[PDB]
């Protein structure tokens, strides 16, 4: 008479292990419940030929996953939360956002570099990153590097760094190699003075049916207040901003003494023009779980009715007062010519 939960995965490894993860920490809430694992593979050709855009194979993957969930084939899903844009379909929500992981961008050396950063490699090293935001900051806060994309997933970037000559370092985030049980390969993590990471980025989101009121109790018990808040204030201000997907566009986030600070920036592609700023609101970290009416929207895409909205629509107030505050500085012009740029492939 049940519902069985019907958990629906890309076939990556890390795709596969973020997965299980929240998987193991439900069945922690709900012992007996019953999940099935289903793991898909199909490939998307449909989802391109509705396209107006370029879509992209990393994009094509989330899209897939959503069709899934709205045929009734899965339940819910688990992406990257900053792989969920700030806008999603309507039939669809994040139904919780889960404790963050590491949020920081982070060095992998070549083993020659042992004890080194970025600031000490010799002028001219080669560091490989196929993220248009990392490339962007990093040429800026080091113009003596030069920085270059780097081909294949993530062992065959650990490969080339330790069979070939070219690159001296890459560019990844620290939670990917945290998930994957590899932190002792990380040489060092970035700061926001070298490189403010991206929205969401360190935290997973699932998601799942809007109006699927059943898996949608069930997935609160996973939202963490705290990276919640944050959440919120980075995913607003970076849809306020409305510039397009991909373009240069960072955060820092803490809750600590009572305030939420949120700092965020625009880069040119290259780096050379830029804006930042921070703002700050009082909000305290709820403790408090909610039965929060259903007829309460979304915010930024995320459904979290048992947590008390107050903070959250703070959050996301805070959020839209720095993307205006960006905005009167010029961002639309930055975003809009890197969003050009980038549209040439
Ligand atoms: C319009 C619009 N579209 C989207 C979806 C979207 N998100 C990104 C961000 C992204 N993703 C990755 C790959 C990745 N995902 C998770 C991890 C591990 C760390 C973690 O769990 O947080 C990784 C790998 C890693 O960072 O080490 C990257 C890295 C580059 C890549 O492999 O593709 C990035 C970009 C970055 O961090 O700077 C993208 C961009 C992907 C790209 O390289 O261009 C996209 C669009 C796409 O797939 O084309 C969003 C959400 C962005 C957000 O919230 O951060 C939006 C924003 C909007 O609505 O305005």
Not at 12 to 38: N, W
Not at 126 to 149: I, Y
Not at 272 to 288: C, F, G, N
Not at 308 to 320: K, M, S, T, W
């Amino acid at each position: 008479k049940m519902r069985v939960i019907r958990v629906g995965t890309r076939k990556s490894q890390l795709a596969r292990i973020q997965t299980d993860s929240v998987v193991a920490t439900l069945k922690a809430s709900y012992p007996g419940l019953q999940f099935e694992i289903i793991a898909m593979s199909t490939t998307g050709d449909k989802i391109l030929d509705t396209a107006l855009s370029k879509i992209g194979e990393k994009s094509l993957f989330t899209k897939e996953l959503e069709h899934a969930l709205e045929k009734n084939e899965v339940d819910l899903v688990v992406h990257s939360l900053k792989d969920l844009p700030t806008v999603l379909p309507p039939g669809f929500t994040i139904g919780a956002i889960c404790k963050r992981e590491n949020p920081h961008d982070a060095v992998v050396f070549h083993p020659k570099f042992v004890g080194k950063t970025l600031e000490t490699l010799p002028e001219k090293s080669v560091v490989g990153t196929s993220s248009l935001r990392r490339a962007a900051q990093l040429q800026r806060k080091f113009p003596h590097l030069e920085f270059r994309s780097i081909r294949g997933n993530l062992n065959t970037w650990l490969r080339k760094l330790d069979e070939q000559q070219e690159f001296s370092a890459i560019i990844l985030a620290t939670a990917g190699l945290q998930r994957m049980g590899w932190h002792n390969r990380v040489g060092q993590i970035l700061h926001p003075e070298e490189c403010m990471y991206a929205v969401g980025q360190g935290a997973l989101g699932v998601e799942v049916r809007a109006k699927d009121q059943d898996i949608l109790d069930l997935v609160g018990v996973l939202h963490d207040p705290e990276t919640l808040l944050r959440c919120i204030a980075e995913r607003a201000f970076l849809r306020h901003l409305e510039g397009g997907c991909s373009v240069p566009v960072a955060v820092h986030t803490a809750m600590k003494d009572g305030q939420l600070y949120l700092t965020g920036g625009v880069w040119s592609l290259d780096g050379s023009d830029s804006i930042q700023e921070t703002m700050q609101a009082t909000i305290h970290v709820p403790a408090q779980h909610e039965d929060g009416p259903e007829d309460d929207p979304q915010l930024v895409g995320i459904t979290a009715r048992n947590i008390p909205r107050g903070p959250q629509l703070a959050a996301q107030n805070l959020g839209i007062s720095l993307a205006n505050l960006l905005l009167s500085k010029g961002a639309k012009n930055i975003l809009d010519v890197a969003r050009q740029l980038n549209d040439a492939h």
